[PDB]
Amino acid sequence: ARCACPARHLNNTNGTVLKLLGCHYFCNGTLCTAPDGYPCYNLTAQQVRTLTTYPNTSCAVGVCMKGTCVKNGTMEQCFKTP
């Protein structure tokens, strides 16, 4: 219930669905985990430090499983949009 709330996702230039950064989000005063199977981006600490409004790194696509973004091999040009 409390975790049915909107959260900021990352976009890409690849023409694919938006994806969560990691598998966790905070909304409605609650720390939440995305459902298993949820499309996500698994970024390295260094990649996160440089994450901006335009693509500047190859982003690891993944699938959320028990709060972990399991990388699937696919890479995308991800970016954030405020």
Binding site: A1, A4, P6, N28, A34
Partner: protein, 64 residues
């Protein structure tokens, strides 16, 4: 292209008496199609727009 998306949906129907007139549709690019409503307690709630309760409320909000 808005990047706000709903990862989970409210499981049950919410009585209209409990909802405000707020409503935003999320991008078609979101992993899961959702409409965002707000409760009178100001909680944003993600709703599955393929459930009829949601369709009924969206209509009710246009007729207002």
């Amino acid at each position: 292209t808005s990047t706000t998306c709903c990862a989970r949906f409210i499981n049950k129907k919410i009585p209209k008496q409990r909802l405000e007139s707020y409503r935003r549709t999320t991008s078609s690019h979101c992993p899961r199609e959702a409409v965002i409503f707000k409760t009178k307690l100001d909680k944003e709630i993600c709703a599955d727009p393929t459930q009829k309760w949601v369709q009924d409320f969206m209509k009710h909000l246009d007729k207002k």
